[PDB]
Design an enzyme around this catalytic site. Sequence first.
Site, mmCIF file in Angstrom:
data_model
loop_
_atom_site.group_PDB
_atom_site.id
_atom_site.type_symbol
_atom_site.label_atom_id
_atom_site.label_comp_id
_atom_site.label_asym_id
_atom_site.label_seq_id
_atom_site.Cartn_x
_atom_site.Cartn_y
_atom_site.Cartn_z
ATOM 1 N N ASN A 1 0.853 -1.189 0.000
ATOM 2 C CA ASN A 1 0.000 0.000 0.000
ATOM 3 C C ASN A 1 0.882 1.230 0.000
ATOM 4 O OD1 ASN A 1 -1.960 1.929 0.346
ATOM 5 N ND2 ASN A 1 -2.439 1.370 2.486
ATOM 6 N N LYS B 1 -0.097 4.104 -0.079
ATOM 7 C CA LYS B 1 -0.863 5.196 0.549
ATOM 8 C C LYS B 1 -0.805 6.444 -0.337
ATOM 9 C CE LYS B 1 -0.061 3.210 5.150
ATOM 10 N NZ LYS B 1 -0.124 3.546 6.632
ATOM 11 N N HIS C 1 -9.661 0.786 4.930
ATOM 12 C CA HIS C 1 -8.383 1.083 5.578
ATOM 13 C C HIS C 1 -8.598 2.044 6.730
ATOM 14 C CE1 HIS C 1 -4.300 2.382 6.383
ATOM 15 N NE2 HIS C 1 -3.905 1.312 5.715
ATOM 16 N N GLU D 1 -7.095 4.520 7.945
ATOM 17 C CA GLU D 1 -6.930 5.955 7.727
ATOM 18 C C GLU D 1 -8.198 6.563 7.135
ATOM 19 O OE1 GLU D 1 -3.403 5.606 5.349
ATOM 20 O OE2 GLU D 1 -2.195 5.104 7.130
ATOM 21 N N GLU E 1 -5.648 -4.655 10.985
ATOM 22 C CA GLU E 1 -4.752 -3.548 11.342
ATOM 23 C C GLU E 1 -4.819 -3.319 12.834
ATOM 24 O OE1 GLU E 1 -4.788 -0.012 8.699
ATOM 25 O OE2 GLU E 1 -6.881 -0.710 8.350
ATOM 26 N N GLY F 1 0.475 5.113 16.361
ATOM 27 C CA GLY F 1 0.487 6.443 16.914
ATOM 28 C C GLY F 1 -0.055 6.468 18.318
ATOM 29 N N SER G 1 2.689 -2.823 11.487
ATOM 30 C CA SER G 1 4.016 -2.464 10.961
ATOM 31 C C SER G 1 4.746 -3.701 10.518
ATOM 32 C CB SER G 1 4.851 -1.707 11.993
ATOM 33 O OG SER G 1 6.147 -1.409 11.483
#
Lengths: 252, 252
Positions: free
Chosen positions: A9, A11, A94, A96, A166, A172, A212
């Site tokens: 991906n 992104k 996804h 995000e 995910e 974060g 990750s």
Amino acid sequence: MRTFFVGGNWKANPKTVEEAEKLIEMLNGAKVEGNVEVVVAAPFFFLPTLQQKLRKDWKVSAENVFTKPNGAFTGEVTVPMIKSFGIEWTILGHSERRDILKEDDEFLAAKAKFALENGMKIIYCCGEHLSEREAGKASEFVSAQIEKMIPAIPAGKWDDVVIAYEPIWAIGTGKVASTQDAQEMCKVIRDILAAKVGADIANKVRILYGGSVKPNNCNELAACPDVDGFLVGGASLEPGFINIVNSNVHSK
Amino acid sequence: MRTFFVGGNWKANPKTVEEAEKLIEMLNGAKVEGNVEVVVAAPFFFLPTLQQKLRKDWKVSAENVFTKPNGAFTGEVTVPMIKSFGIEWTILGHSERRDILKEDDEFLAAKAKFALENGMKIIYCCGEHLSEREAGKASEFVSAQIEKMIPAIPAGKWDDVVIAYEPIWAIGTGKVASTQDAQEMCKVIRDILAAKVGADIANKVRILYGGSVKPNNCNELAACPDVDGFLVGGASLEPGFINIVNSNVHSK
Ligand code: NA
Ligand code: NA
Ligand code: NA
Ligand code: NA
Ligand code: NA
Ligand code: NA
């Protein structure tokens, strides 16, 4: 055995077509080992060049699509547009987009149903946030999402679904995911599928780790029994992507 | 006199690259009369082909862009990506995105600031909904939106802004807009600009009518003194687009 699956991906990267072309030329020279199904997702604007230039044994994917064939949806890209250029794949759901672009489960199920009914293959993303991880309610949260996904899938279309977990709780947040975390949640998902749609389907659906993934952890992640591959983030832009694609030799 | 401006918004259309190429070949053969600045906005996926093939006296535009240069924004397209291909324009704040995709004023001001600071030109859309039209509060609503836009514009960048008024109250509501409605609201906007940023700027900024524009109403709309052009919807996909571009001869 399910065929190991690695989606790259990009992104919202790279910044220029020149960079995307350089990245494609790097991907094109990579020696793949073992057996693996590789999909590369990139910004809409670069999808034509990726489809034209990317090695034909790999497939191109959109990073999102809208719920309709066309229409008064300024700014949106649709299934027929990318299918008209031969692009077979899209990512849906996804983290995000669920978060920053506020995409909800109803929106995402509509996308999955429309995409599948229209001949697309999908990488459907799910995963829980920090509070549910801490509360130990990660499986319930992930189940609910998968349970909203399931009725989107038409009869006969599970061969065209891949699911990516995910660990949003590790993005974060100050917390990191372990290899065992990845195995555990991929197994949770497989068991939800078995219980809800049957073992035959559960045994064939690839479930990917979408946290990750880098050259330094991909081999141990691939070896986990319920991890069937990866939806790779930043490493998909780097020569390390190939190490990840090749980690398939460690999965059985 | 401000140069008449016509933006063609294909929205999420056509469905295939073959159709987009046919439409481009039609646009390329059209005889433009008078003096007019023409911009064509299309889905991200078709922007490369439009930039390559569209007549060079017209300019290509994106229908939206994100707020950042690149990054972890799966599904999003950014300013550097389209600027890297020579695309100079984007639409921002279109009613369909404010509504269906839930884009708020803060998101849109960020886009306008980032786009302008990065060398883009913008078509910034505004307009009130049915309840505010009925309540007779159309000017207050539109003022608030413009007032959120204004501080996004860096010093020296008003030459790179065009504003489009969309009578959202006349979209899918059972109500239709008159030619005088269009004139009135374009004048409202011009006066807000004059009062807030000065007459010199107000006198140069093109303010477009973004409601239903077709061959049968474009000439009377163009003749209104504060209407400087159009952001055209469905007619941008049809040979009638050219009649609209040519309605500039009726505006003074
Ligand atoms: Na628990
Ligand atoms: Na099938
Ligand atoms: Na494995
Ligand atoms: Na009033
Ligand atoms: Na300037
Ligand atoms: Na006019």
